[PDB]
Amino acid sequence: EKRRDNRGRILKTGESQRKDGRYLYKYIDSFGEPQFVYSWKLVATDRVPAGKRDCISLREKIAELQKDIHD
């Protein structure tokens, strides 16, 4: 079991890349409802396509959302 993106980075379970390149992950907030996040960056060192504004990487978004909206 070793899935990779259209480039070559191994993404973990839950993450997903669309044909457009934007990544997609899912997490649960302190409300118990399912919530999905989007990002043109998998890690903080990635770079968004020319013309696209900066975005929070999933690893950074997941850490901040789960560590903040879940103590």
> Taking a C-beta distance cutoff of 8 angstroms, is the pair 32, 69 a contact?
no
Going by their DSSP bridges, the two strands 16-17 and 34-39 should be labelled as: unpaired
Residue 57 CB coordination number (10 Å) = 18
Q: What is the 3-state secondary structure (H, E, C) of 14-66?
A: CCEECCCCCEEEEEECCCCCEEEEEECCCCCCCCCCCCCCCCCCHHHHHHHHH
Give CA–CA dist 16/29, Å, rounded.
19
Give CA–CA dist 38/20, Å, rounded.
12
Q: What is the domain extent for residue 21?
A: 1-71
Domain of 59, CATH number, reads 3.30.160.60
Give CA–CA dist 53/35, Å, rounded.
22
Q: How many domains would you assign to the chain?
A: 1
Question: Position of tokens 């020319």?
Answer: 50
Give CA–CA dist 1/15, Å, rounded.
14
Sign of CA dihedral 23, 46, 54, 29: positive
Report the C-alpha dihedral over residues 51, 58, 9, 53, rounded to 10 degrees: 10
